[PDB]
């Protein structure tokens, strides 16, 4: 599924993630843009050997089980193919894991480099919420 950017903000808001841990809508609609480009399919190889799944690149060396990472945790206890469905709600229930970790959103680091510190409430201007 490609969402629109105002789809994707009703969808997370609705998963509670509008300020969740403290991150507004705009924080994590701007996580989506640059992790995934609102791509629910996305998937990315890392070094390590792991891989980053869905619309915010979960990985599968702590997070999600593919099968093929070596040192994996499955904290999220899902498959990575969970995380690629047009249904957000298993991204969302694991991203919320994982923001609450101890590094807040800087585990995104498309996150970290592109939208912390940005006017994030950009990406939500326009959508009615």
């Known amino acids: ?71 994996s945790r499955n904290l999220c206890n899902i498959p990575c193919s969970a995380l690629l469905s047009s249904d957000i709600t298993a991204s969302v229930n694991c991203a919320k894991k994982i923001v609450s970790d101890g590094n807040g959103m800087n585990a995104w680091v498309a996150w970290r480099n592109r939208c912390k510190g940005t006017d994030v409430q950009a990406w939500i201007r326009g959508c009615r919420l």
């Open 1 to 71: 599924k490609v969402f629109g950017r105002c789809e994707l903000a009703a969808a997370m808001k609705r998963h509670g993630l509008d300020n969740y841990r403290g991150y507004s809508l705009g924080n994590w609609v701007c996580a989506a843009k640059f992790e995934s480009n609102f791509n629910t399919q996305a998937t990315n190889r890392n070094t390590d050997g792991s891989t980053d799944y869905g619309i915010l690149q979960i990985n599968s060396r702590w997070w999600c089980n593919d099968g093929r990472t070596p040192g």
